[PDB]
Amino acid sequence: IQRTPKIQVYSRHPAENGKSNFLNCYVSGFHPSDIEVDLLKNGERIEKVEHSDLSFSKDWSFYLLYYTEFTPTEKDEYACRVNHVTLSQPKIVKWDRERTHSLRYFRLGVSDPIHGVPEFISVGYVDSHPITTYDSVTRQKEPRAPWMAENLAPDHWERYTQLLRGWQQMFKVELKRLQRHYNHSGSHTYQRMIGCELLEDGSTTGFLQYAYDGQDFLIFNKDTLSWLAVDNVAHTIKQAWEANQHELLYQKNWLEEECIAWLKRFLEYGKDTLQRTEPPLVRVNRKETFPGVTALFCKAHGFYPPEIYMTWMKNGEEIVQEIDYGDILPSGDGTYQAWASIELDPQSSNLYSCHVEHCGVHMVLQV
Numbered sequence: 001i002q003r004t005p006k007i008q009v010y011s012r013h014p015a016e017n018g019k020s021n022f023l024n025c026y027v028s029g030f031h032p033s034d035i036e037v038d039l040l041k042n043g044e045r046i047e048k049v050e051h052s053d054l055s056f057s058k059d060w061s062f063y064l065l066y067y068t069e070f071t072p073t074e075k076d077e078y079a080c081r082v083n084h085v086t087l088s089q090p091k092i093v094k095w096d097r098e099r100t101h102s103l104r105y106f107r108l109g110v111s112d113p114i115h116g117v118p119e120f121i122s123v124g125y126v127d128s129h130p131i132t133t134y135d136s137v138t139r140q141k142e143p144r145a146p147w148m149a150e151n152l153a154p155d156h157w158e159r160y161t162q163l164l165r166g167w168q169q170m171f172k173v174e175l176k177r178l179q180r181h182y183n184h185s186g187s188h189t190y191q192r193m194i195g196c197e198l199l200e201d202g203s204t205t206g207f208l209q210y211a212y213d214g215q216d217f218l219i220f221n222k223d224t225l226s227w228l229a230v231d232n233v234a235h236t237i238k239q240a241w242e243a244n245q246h247e248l249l250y251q252k253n254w255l256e257e258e259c260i261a262w263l264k265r266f267l268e269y270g271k272d273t274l275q276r277t278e279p280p281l282v283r284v285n286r287k288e289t290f291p292g293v294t295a296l297f298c299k300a301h302g303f304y305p306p307e308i309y310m311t312w313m314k315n316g317e318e319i320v321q322e323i324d325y326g327d328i329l330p331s332g333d334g335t336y337q338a339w340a341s342i343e344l345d346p347q348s349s350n351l352y353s354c355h356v357e358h359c360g361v362h363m364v365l366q367v
């Protein structure tokens with residue numbers, strides 16, 4: 001099942017003409033992984049374009065960010081051009097107008113990529129921060145964060161590069177078995193996700209899952225040490241794996257113990273960035289796009305962690321049941337932005353208000 005990319009074009013900071021800024025093209029929710037993204041200045045490709053490394057979501061969808069340094073010109077027209085399997089022709093999008101932590105590791109396999117993209121990639125994350133990276137082209141596990149490279153001995157990288165070289169071969173072999181079993185030809189994707197969550201109160205959560213072509217394939221239940229299979233093909237794989245009772249017990253123990261221990265270790269190594277809280281800056285704007293149309297936009301920016309809650313209240317008593325919302329977007333500098341717009345009443349004002357909650361801070365912008 002293919003999924004088409006969600007393309008969102010926006011600036012890192014609120015845009016004002018003549019002031020340098022960063023243009024973002026957040027490309028998310030797409031499957032398979034192969035994509036081509038360009039940023040266009042007045043219809044022309046931009047030579048210097050930065051982009052985060054390929055990232056992975058828990059729904060098996062892929063996400064990325066493309067950014068470039070620019071200064072907004074009232075005349076300049078910036079847009080983002082995306083190529084994907086689901087797009088018979090490129091799609092151009094104009095630029096209009098904490099306490100819970102998680103460690104998780106993903107494995108990605110692509111058969112017949114026919115690209116300068118690796119056959120196998122594996123990335124680790126603490127709270128949406130890539131801590132480590134490994135791929136088949138590199139054949140080496142390298143820290144993706146600086147706080148990870150200043151606390152782990154070089155032997156640690158050697159030891160786990162050996163595990164990842166073996167896991168890579170297993171993924172290549174396991175992927176062929178699935179294509180033969182399904183009689184599939186061409187490029188297909190194999191995905192794995194393992195991780196644990198450490199809640200504020202001390203509770204722990206764990207998960208291990210496999211996906212074939214972006215669809216749930218095998219789900220490990222660590223409470224019953226069973227692999228749940230979606231298909232009869234997955235059932236065949238389930239039977240092979242469930243033979244090795246030792247492997248299953250290791251999964252339970254790695255999730256409940258080693259994973260949380262690793263996570264606590266990392267949350268200290270990166271305490272400066274991971275335990276950081278940046279409060280949001282909220283401004284209310286009034287816009288009249290058409291005659292007799294007025295809307296209020298509660299816009300928040302520069303906060304971390306991305307967990308935020310925004311709402312509008314008519315007369316300061318009850319919530320509005322017609323509130324449009326904006327996605328929480330990565331601005332590119334480690335902070336996040338969002339917005340919430342309501343249609344201003346043509347009648348006499350109800351004295352609307354905006355309410356923002358972020359990490360225990362409550363802001364009310366009564367206008």
Ligand SMILES: *CC1=CN(c2ncnc3nc[nH]c23)[C@H]2C[C@@H]1C(C=O)=CO2
Nearest residue numbers: 105106107122123124132141160194262
């Ligand atoms: C870097 C490491 C990754 N780890 C890991 N465990 C299970 N499945 C994985 N898939 C990719 N990487 C996986 C382990 C060992 C090692 C580590 C510390 O650096 C934590 O967890």
